[PDB]
Design a protein around this ligand. Structure first.
Ligand code: FES
Ligand code: FES
Lengths: 103, 104
């Protein structure tokens, strides 16, 4: 299991654990993280609520983005150069102790 | 609450409740605890399509003009029709009394 920190929109840092292979939405849902609206479509690429902003060194080694994710991601609020839809990103060793930001 | 709205749920059952002019249809659903699975998940912030509703033609054609934002998100909705709108963007007016909207 690995530690993941979430900077929520209110500014509070949510520290929690997930298992390698778990999506970031899985992490939010299982641990009942208090992130308003997160995971609206329950990970079917029909919403932008699971948008997360990653550290650059983490972002650059994420799995190649699919066109389906990109179309949904295009509509997210507060898009950055390090943005992905969290329901598509699964935990890896390199993410231990990483921080993600909820825009 | 002064006007009646009939919601045809995904199971084909009709849920009837009331709201006041000025409320969104999302408000009407969530404030009355209607049993519509996952409806309103992004909380009216135009970031999902879980509040998708299908309107009868005579009501649909009287609705407020759809924004590009709403249209862009509605495009990717399940069961999108010509008479579809995002419910959280639709404010109740007096004309909507006894209208029927359907959840795909
Ligand atoms: S939960 Fe909707 S696209 Fe990620
Ligand atoms: S509740 Fe998400 S867009 Fe209407």
């Amino acid at each position: 299991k690995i530690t993941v920190h979430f900077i929520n929109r209110d500014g509070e840092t949510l520290t929690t654990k997930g298992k390698i292979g778990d999506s970031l939405l899985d992490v939010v849902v299982q641990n009942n993280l208090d992130i308003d609206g997160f995971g609206a479509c329950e990970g079917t690429l029909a919403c932008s609520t699971c948008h997360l902003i990653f550290e650059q060194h983490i972002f650059e080694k994420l799995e190649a983005i699919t066109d389906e994710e990109n179309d949904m991601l295009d509509l997210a609020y507060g898009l950055t150069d390090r943005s992905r839809l969290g329901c598509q990103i699964c935990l890896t060793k390199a993410m231990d102790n990483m921080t993600v930001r909820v825009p």
